[PDB]
Amino acid sequence: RLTELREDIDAILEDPALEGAVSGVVVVDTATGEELYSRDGGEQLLPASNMKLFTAAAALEVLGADHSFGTEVAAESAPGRRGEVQDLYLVGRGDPTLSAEDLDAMAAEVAASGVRTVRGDLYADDTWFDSERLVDDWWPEDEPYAYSAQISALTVAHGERFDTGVTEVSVTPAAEGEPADVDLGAAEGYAELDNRAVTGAAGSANTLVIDRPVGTNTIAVTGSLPADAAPVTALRTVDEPAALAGHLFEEALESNGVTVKGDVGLGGVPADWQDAEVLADHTSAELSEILVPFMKFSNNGHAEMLVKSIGQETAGAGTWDAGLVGVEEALSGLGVDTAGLVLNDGSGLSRGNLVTADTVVDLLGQAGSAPWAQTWSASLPVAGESDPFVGGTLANRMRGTAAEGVVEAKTGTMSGVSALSGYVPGPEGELAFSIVNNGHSGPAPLAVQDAIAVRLAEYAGHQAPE
Numbered sequence: 001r002l003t004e005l006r007e008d009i010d011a012i013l014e015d016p017a018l019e020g021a022v023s024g025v026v027v028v029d030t031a032t033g034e035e036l037y038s039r040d041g042g043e044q045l046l047p048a049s050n051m052k053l054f055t056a057a058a059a060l061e062v063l064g065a066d067h068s069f070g071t072e073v074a075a076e077s078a079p080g081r082r083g084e085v086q087d088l089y090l091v092g093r094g095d096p097t098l099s100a101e102d103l104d105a106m107a108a109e110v111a112a113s114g115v116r117t118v119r120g121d122l123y124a125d126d127t128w129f130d131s132e133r134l135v136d137d138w139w140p141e142d143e144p145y146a147y148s149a150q151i152s153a154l155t156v157a158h159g160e161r162f163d164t165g166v167t168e169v170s171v172t173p174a175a176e177g178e179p180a181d182v183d184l185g186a187a188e189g190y191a192e193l194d195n196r197a198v199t200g201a202a203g204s205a206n207t208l209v210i211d212r213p214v215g216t217n218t219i220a221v222t223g224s225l226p227a228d229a230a231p232v233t234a235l236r237t238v239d240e241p242a243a244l245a246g247h248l249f250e251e252a253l254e255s256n257g258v259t260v261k262g263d264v265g266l267g268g269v270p271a272d273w274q275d276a277e278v279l280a281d282h283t284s285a286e287l288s289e290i291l292v293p294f295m296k297f298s299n300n301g302h303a304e305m306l307v308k309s310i311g312q313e314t315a316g317a318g319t320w321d322a323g324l325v326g327v328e329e330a331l332s333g334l335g336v337d338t339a340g341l342v343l344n345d346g347s348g349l350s351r352g353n354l355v356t357a358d359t360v361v362d363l364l365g366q367a368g369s370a371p372w373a374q375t376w377s378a379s380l381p382v383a384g385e386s387d388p389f390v391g392g393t394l395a396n397r398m399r400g401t402a403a404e405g406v407v408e409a410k411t412g413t414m415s416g417v418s419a420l421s422g423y424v425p426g427p428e429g430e431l432a433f434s435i436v437n438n439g440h441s442g443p444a445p446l447a448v449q450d451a452i453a454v455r456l457a458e459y460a461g462h463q464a465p466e
């Protein structure tokens with residue numbers, strides 16, 4: 001019965017979609033320790049977002065599942081009888097889920113505490129982490145997109161999925177011949193606009209491109225939008241996430257009866273301040289609840305921000321150098337053999353990262369018996385589930401198969417690299433698996449990945465729903 005399972009995974013791995021590719025495939029039973037299958041298990045490969053598994057376990061060991069993140073507004077002293085302050089500071093401490101609403105409610109607290117004129121300048125303080133925005137070997141041409149957002153301690157998160165350091169751009173058509181309407185979203189009055197886009201005839205071709213040219217803070221739009229087209233939206237990153245958070249915070253202050261008379265910029269609390277007055281503050285949800293949008297949708301910003309938060313807890317340094325050692329140590333203290341690991345970031349966007357399929361499975365076994373095991377496995381995408389917040393990146397995969405609603409696994413796809421790793425819980429034993437593909441030269445081999453997980457689910461004692 002175990003001899004036939006091997007013949008089918010051998011046959012699945014023959015597919016022409018794996019032409020010139022190296023693939024690590026390892027399957028293990030969690031109750032016994034029986035290695036049911038092993039192919040190139042100790043070979044070093046790139047993981048893409050499967051590197052988030054390692055990060056997320058280390059964030060729970062170091063910071064704990066009870067951990068939350070704070071944000072504050074500070075002045076040198078309280079406001080007077082006239083209700084005047086000088087300079088104000090908005091100070092961030094690594095919150096990956098700070099919304100525009102959250103800023104509005106802090107701007108109400110500021111007015112409630114007796115302020116009605118900010119006499120000086122307003123400063124944004126992100127000095128809880130270093131000001132290294134991107135990783136060394138990330139590619140400059142990817143910088144306009146939400147997954148390559150710059151890293152900061154003061155960052156504003158968009159929408160219910162909490163995409164940091166970005167703004168939503170909207171393009172609406174007018175009459176044929178007239179320029180199209182571009183909205184910059186939150187970054188209105190912060191980022192610059194370069195609108196070169198026109199409206200085309202009804203039924204003409206959509207040729208619209210939205211860019212942020214490298215080393216600028218400009219949204220550049222070109223092409224035609226047909227008069228009969230549904231309007232277009234796109235998330236785009238900005239330069240200095242903290243300066244935007246600043247810009248968005250004085251708008252909130254102004255909307256709330258507090259007047260800012262000076263300028264807005266970056267800067268930290270002067271230190272010659274002996275007793276700063278805290279006029280407003282906010283507290284995030286706990287890390288266990290934050291792990292859900294993070295792991296279900298594969299958030300890169302969250303992972304890089306959590307690394308730098310590990311550097312603070314272990315060393316007092318908000319840095320990739322220090323946090324990456326913290327990840328490595330915490331993984332060891334849990335029992336993982338980290339001989340084959342090369343750690344260059346938390347998200348897995350770096351092509352400097354290397355894992356092995358034996359290492360991922362080792363992690364999945366150790367995380368299975370850790371005190372925080374249920375909050376860990378809840379964050380992982382479930383196969384074939386409609387609900388975005390239950391299915392995540394596996395929402396439209398393995399539906400109508402024996403794996404629907406059963407297989408819990410993390411994904412990770414890039415040019416030349418793709419991976420699926422997680423749990424197959426069932427009555428015939430709870431399984432752990434890792435599939436890692438490198439070197440393929442077409443579409444990512446997602447159906448080969450699906451095919452194995454489905455076959456393992458039938459082996460674990462499941463059937464396709466009807």
Ligand SMILES: C[C@@H](NC(=O)CCCC[C@@H](N)C(=O)O)C(=O)O
Pocket residue numbers: 048049139142146147298299300349413414415
């Ligand atoms: C998970 C995240 N995207 C990525 O990691 C996509 C990485 C693309 C890198 C690109 N230079 C390439 O090589 O194709 C996202 O879609 O949010």
Ligand SMILES: [Mg+2]
Pocket residue numbers: 186187188189190247251
């Ligand atoms: Mg604005």
Ligand SMILES: [Mg+2]
Pocket residue numbers: 402404405406462463
């Ligand atoms: Mg089932």
